[PDB]
Amino acid sequence: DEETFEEFTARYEKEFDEAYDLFEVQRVLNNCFSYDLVPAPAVIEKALRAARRVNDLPTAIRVFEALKYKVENEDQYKAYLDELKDVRQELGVPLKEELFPS
Amino acid sequence: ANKVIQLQKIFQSSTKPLWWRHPRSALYLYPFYAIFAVAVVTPLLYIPNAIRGIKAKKA
Amino acid sequence: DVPTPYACYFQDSATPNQEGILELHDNIMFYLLVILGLVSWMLYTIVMTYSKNPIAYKYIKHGQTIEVIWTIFPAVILLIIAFPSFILLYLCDEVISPAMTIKAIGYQWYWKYEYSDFINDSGETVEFESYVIPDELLEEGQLRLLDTDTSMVVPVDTHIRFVVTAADVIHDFAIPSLGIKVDATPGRLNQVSALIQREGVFYGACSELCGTGHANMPIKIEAVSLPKFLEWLNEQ
Amino acid sequence: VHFKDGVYENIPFKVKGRKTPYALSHFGFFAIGFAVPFVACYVQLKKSGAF
Amino acid sequence: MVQRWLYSTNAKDIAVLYFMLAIFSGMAGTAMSLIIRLELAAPGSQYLHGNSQLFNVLVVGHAVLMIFFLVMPALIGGFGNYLLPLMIGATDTAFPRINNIAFWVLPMGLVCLVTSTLVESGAGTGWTVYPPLSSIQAHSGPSVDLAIFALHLTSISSLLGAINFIVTTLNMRTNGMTMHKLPLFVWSIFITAFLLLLSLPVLSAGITMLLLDRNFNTSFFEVSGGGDPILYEHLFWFFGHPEVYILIIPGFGIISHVVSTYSKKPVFGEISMVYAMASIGLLGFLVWSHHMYIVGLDADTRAYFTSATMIIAIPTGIKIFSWLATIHGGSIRLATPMLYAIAFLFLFTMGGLTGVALANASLDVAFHDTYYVVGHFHYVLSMGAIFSLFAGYYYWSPQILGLNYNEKLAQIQFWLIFIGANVIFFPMHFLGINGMPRRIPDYPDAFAGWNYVASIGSFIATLSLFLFIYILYDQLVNGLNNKVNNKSVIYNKAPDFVESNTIFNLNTVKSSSIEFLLTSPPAVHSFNTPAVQS
Amino acid sequence: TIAPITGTIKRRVIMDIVLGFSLGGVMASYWWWGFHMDKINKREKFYAELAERKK
Amino acid sequence: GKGDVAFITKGVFLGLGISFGLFGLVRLLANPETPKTMNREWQLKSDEYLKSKNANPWGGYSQVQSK
Amino acid sequence: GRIGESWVITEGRRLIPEIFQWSAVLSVCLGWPGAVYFFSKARKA
Amino acid sequence: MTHLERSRHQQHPFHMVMPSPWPIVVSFALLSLALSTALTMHGYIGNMNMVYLALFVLLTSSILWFRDIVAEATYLGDHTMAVRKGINLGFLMFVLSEVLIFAGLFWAYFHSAMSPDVTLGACWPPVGIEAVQPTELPLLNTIILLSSGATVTYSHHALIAGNRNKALSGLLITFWLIVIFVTCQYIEYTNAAFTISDGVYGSVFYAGTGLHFLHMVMLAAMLGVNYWRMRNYHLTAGHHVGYETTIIYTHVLDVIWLFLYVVFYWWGV
Ligand code: HEA
Ligand code: HEA
Ligand code: CUA
Ligand SMILES: [Ca+2]
Numbered sequence A: 001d002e003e004t005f006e007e008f009t010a011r012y013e014k015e016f017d018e019a020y021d022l023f024e025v026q027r028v029l030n031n032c033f034s035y036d037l038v039p040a041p042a043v044i045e046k047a048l049r050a051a052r053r054v055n056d057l058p059t060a061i062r063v064f065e066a067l068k069y070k071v072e073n074e075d076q077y078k079a080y081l082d083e084l085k086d087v088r089q090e091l092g093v094p095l096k097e098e099l100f101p102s
Numbered sequence B: 001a002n003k004v005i006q007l008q009k010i011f012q013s014s015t016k017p018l019w020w021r022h023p024r025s026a027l028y029l030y031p032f033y034a035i036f037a038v039a040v041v042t043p044l045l046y047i048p049n050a051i052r053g054i055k056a057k058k059a
Numbered sequence C: 001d002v003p004t005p006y007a008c009y010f011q012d013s014a015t016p017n018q019e020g021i022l023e024l025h026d027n028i029m030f031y032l033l034v035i036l037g038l039v040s041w042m043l044y045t046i047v048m049t050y051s052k053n054p055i056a057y058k059y060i061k062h063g064q065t066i067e068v069i070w071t072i073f074p075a076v077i078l079l080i081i082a083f084p085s086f087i088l089l090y091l092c093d094e095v096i097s098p099a100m101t102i103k104a105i106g107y108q109w110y111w112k113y114e115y116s117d118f119i120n121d122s123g124e125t126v127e128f129e130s131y132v133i134p135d136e137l138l139e140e141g142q143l144r145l146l147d148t149d150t151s152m153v154v155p156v157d158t159h160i161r162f163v164v165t166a167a168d169v170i171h172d173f174a175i176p177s178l179g180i181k182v183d184a185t186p187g188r189l190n191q192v193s194a195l196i197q198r199e200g201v202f203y204g205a206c207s208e209l210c211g212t213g214h215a216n217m218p219i220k221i222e223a224v225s226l227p228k229f230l231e232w233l234n235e236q
Numbered sequence D: 001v002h003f004k005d006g007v008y009e010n011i012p013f014k015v016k017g018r019k020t021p022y023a024l025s026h027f028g029f030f031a032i033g034f035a036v037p038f039v040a041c042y043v044q045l046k047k048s049g050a051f
Numbered sequence E: 001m002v003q004r005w006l007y008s009t010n011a012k013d014i015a016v017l018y019f020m021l022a023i024f025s026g027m028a029g030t031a032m033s034l035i036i037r038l039e040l041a042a043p044g045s046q047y048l049h050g051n052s053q054l055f056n057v058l059v060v061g062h063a064v065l066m067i068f069f070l071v072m073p074a075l076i077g078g079f080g081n082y083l084l085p086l087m088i089g090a091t092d093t094a095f096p097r098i099n100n101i102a103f104w105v106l107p108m109g110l111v112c113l114v115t116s117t118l119v120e121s122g123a124g125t126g127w128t129v130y131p132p133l134s135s136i137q138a139h140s141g142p143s144v145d146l147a148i149f150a151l152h153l154t155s156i157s158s159l160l161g162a163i164n165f166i167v168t169t170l171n172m173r174t175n176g177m178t179m180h181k182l183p184l185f186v187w188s189i190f191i192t193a194f195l196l197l198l199s200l201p202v203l204s205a206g207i208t209m210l211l212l213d214r215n216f217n218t219s220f221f222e223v224s225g226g227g228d229p230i231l232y233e234h235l236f237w238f239f240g241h242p243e244v245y246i247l248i249i250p251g252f253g254i255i256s257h258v259v260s261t262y263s264k265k266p267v268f269g270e271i272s273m274v275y276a277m278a279s280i281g282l283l284g285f286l287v288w289s290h291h292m293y294i295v296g297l298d299a300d301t302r303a304y305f306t307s308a309t310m311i312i313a314i315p316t317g318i319k320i321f322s323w324l325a326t327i328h329g330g331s332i333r334l335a336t337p338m339l340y341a342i343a344f345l346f347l348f349t350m351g352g353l354t355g356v357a358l359a360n361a362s363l364d365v366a367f368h369d370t371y372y373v374v375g376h377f378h379y380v381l382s383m384g385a386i387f388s389l390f391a392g393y394y395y396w397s398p399q400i401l402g403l404n405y406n407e408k409l410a411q412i413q414f415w416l417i418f419i420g421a422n423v424i425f426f427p428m429h430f431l432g433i434n435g436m437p438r439r440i441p442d443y444p445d446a447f448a449g450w451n452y453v454a455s456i457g458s459f460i461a462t463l464s465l466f467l468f469i470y471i472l473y474d475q476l477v478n479g480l481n482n483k484v485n486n487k488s489v490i491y492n493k494a495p496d497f498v499e500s501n502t503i504f505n506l507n508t509v510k511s512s513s514i515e516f517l518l519t520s521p522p523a524v525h526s527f528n529t530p531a532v533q534s
Numbered sequence F: 001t002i003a004p005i006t007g008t009i010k011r012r013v014i015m016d017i018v019l020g021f022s023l024g025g026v027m028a029s030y031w032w033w034g035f036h037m038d039k040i041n042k043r044e045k046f047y048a049e050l051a052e053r054k055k
Numbered sequence G: 001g002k003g004d005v006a007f008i009t010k011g012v013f014l015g016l017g018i019s020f021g022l023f024g025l026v027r028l029l030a031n032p033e034t035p036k037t038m039n040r041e042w043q044l045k046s047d048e049y050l051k052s053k054n055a056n057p058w059g060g061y062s063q064v065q066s067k
Numbered sequence H: 001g002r003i004g005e006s007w008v009i010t011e012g013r014r015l016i017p018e019i020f021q022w023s024a025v026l027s028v029c030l031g032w033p034g035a036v037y038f039f040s041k042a043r044k045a
Numbered sequence I: 001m002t003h004l005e006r007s008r009h010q011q012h013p014f015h016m017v018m019p020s021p022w023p024i025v026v027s028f029a030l031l032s033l034a035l036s037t038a039l040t041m042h043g044y045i046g047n048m049n050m051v052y053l054a055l056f057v058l059l060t061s062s063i064l065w066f067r068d069i070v071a072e073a074t075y076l077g078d079h080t081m082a083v084r085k086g087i088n089l090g091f092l093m094f095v096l097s098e099v100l101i102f103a104g105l106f107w108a109y110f111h112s113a114m115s116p117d118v119t120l121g122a123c124w125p126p127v128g129i130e131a132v133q134p135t136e137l138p139l140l141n142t143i144i145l146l147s148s149g150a151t152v153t154y155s156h157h158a159l160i161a162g163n164r165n166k167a168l169s170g171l172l173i174t175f176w177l178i179v180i181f182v183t184c185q186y187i188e189y190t191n192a193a194f195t196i197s198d199g200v201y202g203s204v205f206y207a208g209t210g211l212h213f214l215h216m217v218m219l220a221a222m223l224g225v226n227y228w229r230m231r232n233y234h235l236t237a238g239h240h241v242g243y244e245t246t247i248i249y250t251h252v253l254d255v256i257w258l259f260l261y262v263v264f265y266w267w268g269v
């Protein structure tokens, strides 16, 4: 791949839109977090809507666990949590830290 | 004298092992097992004299 | 000159060959420790930061701009460690104008030395056999499996040429602090040189499997000043 | 020849249904191998009068 | 029962016969090394009442058993004959009766080597059986003849198996597998078989020359008669360095499988690994006189041989940097094959760096026939090839046996052999750099200090071998229960981070070779219809 | 916005390789300038005191 | 899982202890008489000779390692 | 943009303890014969 | 053909060999040969009857193995195209191994001859050794080998061309010329001045050309079994692979005899 970041996001948006079951959305999410970039907010949003279409709730929690493991800081994680807050509360998924508080 | 089809019809339509399927196999296979059975165990009888150091009689 | 208990380095040098061998070994060990530190640091940091990594970057396969670098960089470090090695190799081979020849013939489990220059007033060739002192006849203070009954005595600050052969099997005339190791094969005559820089006594051993007396086959070289060498040679 | 499939049929030795314990066969297979140089040592020391 | 195992013609049975013989002979060679190292523990006669001939005979037996009867029939004989047909999708090997005689000529080499020990005094000559010590004047009797016949029967086995391997992977590959799409272990066995085919002839010629010198009054290496033993050194070591690359290249293949399946990411630059292995195999024929630096060559001879011995550090460096790159960025699952592979990646590089210290003929005058050389080669042998052999066993044993091993006992065994081997072979560099020669049963008293700690480490190594014997017993008896309880790792790959535990259950194995897709213990007719590959 | 967070393995392997060469460099430089250039100095002060004991 | 690191630490230290103990018990089966040179007095009397012969000047020459 | 803490801080606080751990593991993996020599009688202690 | 009937065959072109006793029988014969020769070489056995018995058992067990190979290839139809390609590749790797044995022997000759010893006199061939002149009988031995190849070439191409008498006669001429060469080598070995004990010269000379002699007597044997199988109609016009391996074997023994000729008889005299 000589891919730019924008070709990555436009590839994986339409890749998440064409997943049709739980094997495919988990597979596509796996091989989009297996790159050397945190995904853009738009493709994480598309991943959340795709896990909504297949009706699996822990994958939409594991999305946020994955980007917690994937970002460099905790303020990048909080920046994702800021403007991904509306889609997260609209879908109604909880983050793992507030679901299993230690 | 071109027995090859007649021998194909024996070797394919047979139950015996492949080295037994020819009619003349009892003439080869029964002496060979005796010659082989003495040929593999007679040096093993000389192994203890070779360990002890006893050479055979030549003079 | 002699091994010491629990040692981990070379014996102390006595010739320029051995003191060059030590410097080449340390120069090689420098870059060897660089490479060892690199690969051990990578092998530590990778299994300590990716054992707890739950997402594997499974699309990293090529790396074109750095495969050429880790092909090229071992080659230039081979060139750097190979530059002094060739200089030492082509310095240690020349035996130019020696002031003494000594033949050393390995028989089965003794060495036989032969000064053959007729610089004596006797004018005859000097030979003797040097056997290991056996363990039951070691008088007190002697070094076990190293001391001999007769000795090879050599003057200092003298280019000496050792011509080495054998009589029945392959032996090895080897003294490490002088830095000579030379195979005694029963067909041919090899030569090495030395210049002993300090007086003393230097031990060595047969470093080639001769048979059942292979451990009992030592070399002992007393390097003295040239007056004392002459007064030793006047007897034998 | 058609041979039997399964879990224990790939080995030349018997493990499960035996009238003797298997550890007999298992550890006597390896103790003989560990004991060949000791038989070697014994006969080449008896030949050299050390025993 | 007699037709399956005596009259055998399937490769998967001949492989386990190879493995049984290999581990038997490895117990024999480890006992011999325990006797060697127990005699070497302190100055003076300790256990063998003097009798340095018996010491030399034990050193010969240790080297020959561990090389030609453990590592070659283990790696090539067991793992190649088992896995190369299963990984190229072949139903069996080409030429299977050849494949059976290449096993059954190994117990006969074993019995003639053991009676070589039992006749007059044994052949105490080193494993490189040099004339004139190996002649009829210095070794009277049938000892060396029987050792030479042991080498002949082992060379017959490893030549027939090499022909078998070359033809069965050039001819019986399944119907999508081009040569570029081969697994790395198949390329290992392939290149190893070419090295065998090109190198075993010259060894057979040299030791048949020696046998005719001993018994038929001919003079190839008899000096009073026109011979030269340096001809024997050339003819031996032209086999002898290809032999030691034969010992290590299937280890490279096993490590490249293990590291990738326990890093959960593919090997960094696979075709460059194939090129590197082929370059090592090609360049291994050009370096044979680095074992002959002392014998009296020219200076330009030794200059070329330092250059050529040095430039094999480039493809091995490419392989080892590629192994570090294929564990970088991974998800390491620390199982026992992964522990053995990481220990390989450290200790083999230490042995190789002492190897490039030895590559300089300028410097090898300080280290030849010392215990430094013993340190180099026992690193790259008993920590390269033995560690890759243990990795292959712990990597393939539950698949091809159907029975899992105790994981905690396996890791205890790994840590014990990793401690014990270091404690044996790390002080040997100190002894060799201080001047301690090889093949001596007794030494000066100044060498006692590291010899004692080395023979203490010897007991740790054989204790871990005894633990490995118990691990085999527990696998054979309780191997069906180790799947049920939590005594073993059932899946060598965990789920990925977003892969459900139920979505993992439809795709339990994720491998790039056929070996882990088969039925456990694999069928007597695997591949009735041929496997297919894009 | 959220600016693109890319290339952490790139700068991670770059700092890892630089750190590995620097740690190997300090080990090797200790080897040379602290063991080798002590053995050399203990040798050469002996040779220089011998060359004055011979007057 | 749940205390098996401790198990394969205790097993390693137990294997080390068993190996040391069995090494001792089969060192008890060796030759009862060590060579005469392996005591302190012989090694001082060898360092006598080595000091007289200027052996190993910048390293060390001392041979005493026993009691 | 460069959101958050600096990468020199983020990777220094990760790489600094592993340097010390690597130093400890390397010195026990290489300098373990020093622990035998220290207790040997050749040190005359 | 239908699926029901295609399912009654193998689905892959490769020979699944039936279990056979001759691997372990030849292995025990090699054991008995090794253990017999190592004890008759040193006098622990009275006569050579054990070595004779062991070599006889080895030869007959190899013959029974080859009989089973002939039975599989002719009377069971088990050698498909892939099996033929594999057998040809295995024989090519075999002849490469034997060329490498001869390369080791040529290395021995050259290491003795490039700079000889002082115990022979810095001389090659050594002093007192009456060397075999390359003009008399070894020239006839090169001629009857270059001609034997020319006979077996037309015998092969007439086997392909449908001729029976022109192939059998060419095979017969090839076999008789090979045994002419073997008897001429026996005559040279009898009327040779030096023996194998006469120093390193006799060693390397008789080693090289005696290994070639042994390969030629096995060549005469396989030319005989090819004549037998061609007369008894086993060999066919498109499927004759043992014949092809024998042709490859003749044409490599020809070129290594030429190297033996120009090295051992022209450069080394
Ligand atoms: C295969 C190579 C190999 C291996 C593994 C070993 C293993 C050992 N060797 Fe040696 N050795 C040689 C090859 C090897 N050696 C050679 C070539 C020589 C030269 C001979 C000569 O000079 O002529 C030599 C000589 C040699 C010397 C030099 C002595 C001399 O010069 O005379 C010493 C020193 O003590 C020694 C000791 C040991 C010890 C204590 C082990 C211990 O490491 C043993 C511990 C190892 C294990 C416990 C391995 C596990 C055992 C298995 C059976 C594996 C089973 C696993 C499966 C089947 C999956 N051997
Ligand atoms: C397992 C088999 C094996 C392997 C793989 C090797 C690998 C090497 N060996 Fe060794 N060797 C033996 C088995 C083996 N050896 C045996 C059995 C003996 C003694 C025989 C006897 O006498 O009985 C022996 C002895 C031996 C000698 C003879 C010395 C003597 O007898 O006096 C020499 C001489 O050059 C040598 C050198 C090398 C080199 C240069 C490598 C190289 O292939 C190693 C390459 C690996 C590396 C170099 C490390 C990794 C690379 C990097 C990290 C890249 C950066 C490094 C650099 C640029 C240097 N070894
Ligand atoms: Cu002379 Cu070893
Ligand atoms: Ca001893």
Ligand SMILES: [Cu+2]
Pocket (backbone or CB within 6 Å): E240, E241, E244, E290, E291
């Ligand atoms: Cu080599």
Ligand SMILES: [Mg+2]
Pocket (backbone or CB within 6 Å): C207, C208, E368, E369
């Ligand atoms: Mg040597």
